[PDB]
Design a protein around this ligand. Structure first.
Ligand SMILES: O=C(O)c1ccc(C(=O)OCCO)cc1
Length: 261
C-alpha cells in the first residue's frame, strides 16, 4: 500500500538493536573525488531497491569517524547514508550546510551506479552533530524540498529558524556544555513554526559527545523520524506520537512535538 515501506513491522527492540535488518556495504568517497566537501563514506543496503538518502555532517574539529556508527545504523534500516568529512575541520555551520548539500548531490549524480541506483532522489534528509546540526538547520532552511532534518546536539549562532518547514527532530543533551540546550537546541525548536511537523527530544544524562557513542535512543528516534517522513511510513508514527515519556520512570529528559503530524 505504501511502496516506500522497507523492512519489517517495527518494535522498540528492533529499533533499539545495534543494527536493523538490512545488510550494509560501503562506498568510499575520496577527498579528490568529492566536489564541495571533504569526502566520506556512503553506507547503503546490499539488497537492490530504491531508498531514501541522507547526508550527515560531523562537528567542529571532528571527522566522519565520530558519526560512523550512525551512518551504518541508519543504512541498516533501509537508507543510503553518507557520513562526510568537511573541507577543513574548522568549517563553520553555514559552510557545513553547503557541504552537506554537495554530499547529497554527490550521492545522486557522481557516485557509482551501485549507489545511484539505490537512491530515490526525490526523498532526501539531512543530519549533523553539533556544528553539523546547525548545518542541518541551515540546509533545511535553504531546501524546503528536503523530507526530514535531524540536528543532533546542534550548535549555531543564529537562533531563528522560523524559515524551516522541513519536518525537523532536534535532539538535545541535558549535560551538553558545548551547545547548552538553553541557548541552542531549545531556541532552535521554539523558533521553528508551530505549524510544521517537529519534535524536541532531550537526552537524560548525556553530554555533547552522546551522538558520537552508539545510542539506543538516538538510533531509535532518528530512524523513526526518517521512516515517518522520508518514507511516509506511518508504521513509525506510534513511536513519535505521543513519543517517549519524559515523566516518572520515563525514557527521556524532555519530549515535545506537534503531533499529530
Ligand atoms: O566552542 C564552540 O563554540 C564549539 C565547540 C564545538 C562545536 C562542535 O560542533 O563540536 C563538535 C565536535 O565534533 C561547536 C562550537
Amino acid at each position: 500500500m505504501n511502496p516506500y515501506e522497507r523492512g519489517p513491522n517495527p518494535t522498540d527492540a528492533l529499533l533499539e538493536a545495534r543494527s536493523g535488518p538490512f545488510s550494509v556495504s560501503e562506498e568510499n568517497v575520496s577527498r579528490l573525488s568529492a566536489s564541495g566537501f571533504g569526502g566520506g563514506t556512503i553506507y547503503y543496503p546490499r539488497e537492490n531497491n530504491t531508498y531514501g538518502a541522507v547526508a550527515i555532517s560531523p562537528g567542529y574539529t571532528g571527522t566522519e569517524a565520530s558519526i560512523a556508527w550512525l551512518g551504518e545504523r541508519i543504512a541498516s534500516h533501509g537508507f543510503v547514508v553518507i557520513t562526510i568529512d568537511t573541507i577543513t575541520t574548522l568549517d563553520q555551520p553555514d559552510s557545513r550546510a553547503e557541504q552537506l548539500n554537495a554530499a547529497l548531490n554527490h550521492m545522486i549524480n557522481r557516485a557509482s551506479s551501485t549507489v545511484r541506483s539505490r537512491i530515490d532522489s526525490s526523498r532526501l534528509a539531512v543530519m549533523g552533530h553539533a556544528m553539523g546540526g546547525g548545518g542541518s538547520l541551515r540546509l533545511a532552511s535553504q531546501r524546503p524540498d528536503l523530507k526530514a532534518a535531524i540536528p543532533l546536539t546542534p550548535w549555531h549562532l543564529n537562533k531563528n529558524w522560523s524559515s524551516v518547514t522541513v519536518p525537523t527532530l532536534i535532539i538535545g543533551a541535558d549535560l551538553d556544555t558545548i551547545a547548552p540546550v538553553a541557548t541552542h537546541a531549545k531556541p532552535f525548536y521554539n523558533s521553528l513554526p508551530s505549524s510544521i511537523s517537529k519534535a524536541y527530544l532531550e537526552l537524560d544524562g548525556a553530554t555533547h559527545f552522546a551522538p558520537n557513542i552508539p545510542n539506543k535512543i538516538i538510533g531509535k528516534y532518528s530512524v523513526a523520524w526518517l521512516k515517518r517522513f522520508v518514507d511516509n511510513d506511518t508504521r513509525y508514527t506510534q513511536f513519535l506520537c505521543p513519543g517517549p515519556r519524559d515523566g516518572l520512570f520515563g525514557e527521556v529528559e524532555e519530549y515535545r512535538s506537534t503531533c499529530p503530524f
